Amino acid sequence: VKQDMPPVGGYGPIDYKRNLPRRGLSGYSMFAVGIGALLFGYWSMMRWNRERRRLQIEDFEARIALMP
Amino acid sequence: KNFSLRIDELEEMLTNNRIWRNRTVDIGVVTAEDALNYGFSGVMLRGSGIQWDL
């Protein structure tokens, strides 16, 4: 008997494809998301800084009423 | 099969990697006349102009 190494009928394919799924996000939308979250941070920044200025004026009033 | 996958993944990691393109584009210009008179053979001749393949 002869027991060489042939392939059995022909093997399957091996892909030579360039895999580029191009994800993605449509970057003008990413500009929109970044500017939106950035402006939301600005509004929160405004609100907290002005409430803390109210409290810091209360600290001023404490030292003024405590001075003499 | 596994190596076709891994070479697609190497083209994904490098290869339109912007910083490696910024590293190596401007260098390596070779005229086909210089590629034939400077005794070049193979991948230089492939990459610069003339169709040549033994």
Quick take:
This is part of a larger assembly, with chains A (about 70 residues) and B (about 55 residues). With about 70 residues, chain A is mainly alpha-helical.
Summarize the structure in words:
This is part of a larger assembly, with chains A (68 residues) and B (54 residues). In chain A, 57% of the residues lie in helices and 0% in strands. With 68 residues, chain A is an all-alpha fold. Chain A is rod-shaped and about 115 Å long. By secondary structure, chain B is mostly helical. Chain B is built from four helices and no strands. The A-B interface holds A 14-20 and B 1, 4, 8, 11-12. The PDB classes it as electron transport. The entry lists the keywords complex I, cellular respiration, mitochondria, electron transport. The entry is titled "Ovine respiratory complex I FRC open class 3".
SSE diagram, text form:
This is part of a larger assembly, with chains A (68 residues) and B (54 residues).
Chain A (H helix, E strand, L loop, with lengths): L27 H39 L2
Chain B lengths: L1 H12 L4 H6 L8 H6 L5 H5 L7
PDB class: electron transport
Keywords: cellular respiration, mitochondria
Entry title: Ovine respiratory complex I FRC open class 3
Report the count of strand segments of chain A.
Answer: 0
Helix content of chain A: 55-70%
Number of strands of chain B: 0
Q: Could you say which structural class the secondary elements and strand pairing of chain A correspond to?
A: mainly alpha
End-to-end CA span of chain A: 117 Å
Radius of gyration of chain A: 35 Å
Give the count of helical stretches of chain A.
Answer: 1
Strand percentage of chain B lies at: under 5%
> What's the main sheet of chain A like?
none
Greatest contact pair?
A: A-B, 7 and 5 residues
Overall, the morphology of chain A is rod-shaped
Name the quaternary structure. Answer: part of a larger assembly
Distance between the termini of chain B: 28 Å
Query: What amount of the residues of chain A lies in strands?
Result: under 5%
